[PDB]
Ligand binder design. Sequence first.
Ligand SMILES: C/C=C(/C)CC/C=C(\C)CCCC(C)C
Ligand SMILES: C/C=C(/C)CC/C=C(\C)CCCC(C)C
Ligand SMILES: [Mg+2]
Ligand SMILES: [Mg+2]
Ligand SMILES: [Mg+2]
Ligand SMILES: [Mg+2]
Ligand SMILES: [Mg+2]
Ligand SMILES: [Mg+2]
Lengths: 308, 303
Amino acid sequence: DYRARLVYPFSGAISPHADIVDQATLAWAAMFGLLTDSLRHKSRRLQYGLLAARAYPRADREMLQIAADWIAWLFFMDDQCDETGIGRDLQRMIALHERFLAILDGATPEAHDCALTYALADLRRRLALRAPDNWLRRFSEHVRLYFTANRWETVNRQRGATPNVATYCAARLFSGAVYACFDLIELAEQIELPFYARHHSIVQQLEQAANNIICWCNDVLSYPKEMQHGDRHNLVLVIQGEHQCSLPEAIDRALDLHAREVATFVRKRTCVPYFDAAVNTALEKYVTGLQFWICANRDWSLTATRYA
Amino acid sequence: QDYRARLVYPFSGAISPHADIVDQATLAWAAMFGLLKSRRLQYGLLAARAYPRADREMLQIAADWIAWLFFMDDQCDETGIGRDLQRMIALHERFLAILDGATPEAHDCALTYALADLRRRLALRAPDNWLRRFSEHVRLYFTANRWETVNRQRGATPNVATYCAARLFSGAVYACFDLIELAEQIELPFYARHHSIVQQLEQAANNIICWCNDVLSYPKEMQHGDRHNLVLVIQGEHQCSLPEAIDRALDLHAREVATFVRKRTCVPYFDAAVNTALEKYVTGLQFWICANRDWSLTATRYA
Ligand SMILES: C/C=C(/C)CC/C=C(\C)CCCC(C)C
Ligand SMILES: C/C=C(/C)CC/C=C(\C)CCCC(C)C
Ligand SMILES: [Mg+2]
Ligand SMILES: [Mg+2]
Ligand SMILES: [Mg+2]
Ligand SMILES: [Mg+2]
Ligand SMILES: [Mg+2]
Ligand SMILES: [Mg+2]
C-alpha cells in the first residue's frame, strides 16, 4: 500500500459548510453549462466542494463558494486538456486561451464564447467584489502561467516527447494552477501582507515546497488514469523515462522526493525572519494556509472517485 | 580608509562600444522632456556597462530608463515629496495609469510624459507578457518608495530583515533585470524564467547591487537625514560604530557574492536551447553587478 507513505507531521481541517458548498458548486456547474452528457449520475460524486472545504477550512461561506466554484472550473478545464482532443491541438488551445486572457483583462464574453469562458468571467466578477486590483493582477498572472503550462503539455503530446525530471518539475509548479489557489488563502484568511513579506525568498521557497508536495502527491495518485489516456505529465512516468527503471522503482523514487520535500517545508517554516508582530501574525496564517492545502489535496484525493 | 576596495567580484564586466553616443543622446532626451555639470551625470555610461551586447536602439531605451529612475529617485530622496505620502500616492496613480497605456494630459508632470515615451518605445520591442512583468516590477518600486516615505514621516528605522526584504524593490533592479531579455534577444520559457535557482540568482544579484550602492551612498544619504541604507540600519539594530556597521555591510556583500557564484553551479539542465538562453540571462546579471560597482566608483553622484 504505497498510498500509506503519503504522510505529513501535521493535520488538516474541513469547513462546517462543506456539503452546502458542494451542492452549490454542482448547481453553479449546471447554471454555466459545464456538466457533460456522460456525467449525468457521475456529477453527484465529483465532490469538488469537499476539496475546497478542506483547502480553506476557516473561510466565510461566500468566499469558500468562490474557491469551490474556481476548483470545479480547474477540474472541468483539466479534463478537456487531459482527456479530449483539444489537449493534442495547440492552435485550438491558443484560440480558447485568447478568449480566457481577454476575460482576465475584464472583457465581457461574446454571444459565441464557450461555457468555460462565461464561467471564468463569473469568477473574475465575484473575486473583483472581494479583492483589490493588486491581488486580481497577481491571481490573473498565476492563471496565465497555468494556460502557458497547458500549451506546454499540448506540444509535448503533439511531439510525443516526455520531459526530463528538471523540466517536468519546473513546469508542474504551473500546470496544476496551485499558485492561483494559494492566492485565495489571503482572501479566505482576510490577510494583507506587505510587498516585502509577500515576495520574501523564504515565503517563495515555502510556496514552492507546498506546490511540489501537492503535485507529486497527485502524480502518485493519478498515474493509473494518466497512463490509461497515454499521457506523460506525471513524476512517476518522467522518473521511469529518465532512469529507465520499473514502475514500482519509479513510484518508490517519487515517494522519496515527496517525503524529502515535506522535510524541506517543515525545515524552512522555522527560517521565516521576524519583520514585526503584525506582519509575522499574518505570515503565520498564510503558511498555516499552505499546510491546510497540503493536507486537503491528500485527504480528498485518497477517497475521491477521480483517482479510484 | 580603503573600504571601497573590498567591493570585489570573481568576474569582470564589459561596456557597449556605443557608450558615448548613447550617453550624449540620454542627456539630450532628458533635456527634451525637462527632467534636467549635466555632462558629469553619465547615466548612459551605466546603461552601456549593464547591457554591453545590446543593439544601440535597445541600449538607448535602457539608458533613458536608468536616467528616468535617477531623476525620480532624487525627487524621492532629496525633495519634500519623499516626506509626503498623499503627494506620492497622487503622482504614482498617474504613473500606474501611463503604465496601463493611458495618454498623458496638460496637468501631468515631466516624469509622467517621459515614462509614457519609454512605455511606447518598449511596446515596439517587447510582447504583452513582458510589459506586464516589467510594469509589476515598476509598480512594486513605487510601493517600496511609499514604504520609504512612511518611514521618513513616522521617523522609524526598519530592522535588517525588513530593510533587506524591501530594498529588493526600492532600487527597481528587478525592472532593470527584465531589460536583459530584450538586450540579449532571448525568450526563456515560463518554467525556466520562474525556476527557484533563477529567482535565487536574481535575489543575490539584486542584494549585491543594492548593498554595494549602500556602502558607496551612505554619506550623501546621511547628509539628507535618510535611513534607507544597510550601513545605517545595521548601526541602529546592533548599536555599533559607523566603521563596524560598514565592515558588517561588506561581510554581507562578500557572502552574497559567494552565494551568487555557488548558485550559478546549481542551474539544472533543461535542454540545449533553454540552457543557452539561461546562461545569456545569468551572464547579464553578472554584467549588472559589475556595471553598478564600476560606474559608481567613478560617478560624481557618490563623490
Ligand atoms: C491543480 C491540480 C493539482 C493536481 C493540485 C490541486 C488541484 C486543484 C487546485 C484543482 C484541479 C485543477 C486541475 C489542474 C486538475
Ligand atoms: C536602482 C538602484 C541601485 C542602487 C542600482 C541600480 C541603479 C538604477 C537602476 C537607477 C538608480 C535610481 C533608482 C534607485 C530608482
Ligand atoms: Mg492536468
Ligand atoms: Mg489531469
Ligand atoms: Mg495528475
Ligand atoms: Mg537615492
Ligand atoms: Mg532611493
Ligand atoms: Mg543609495
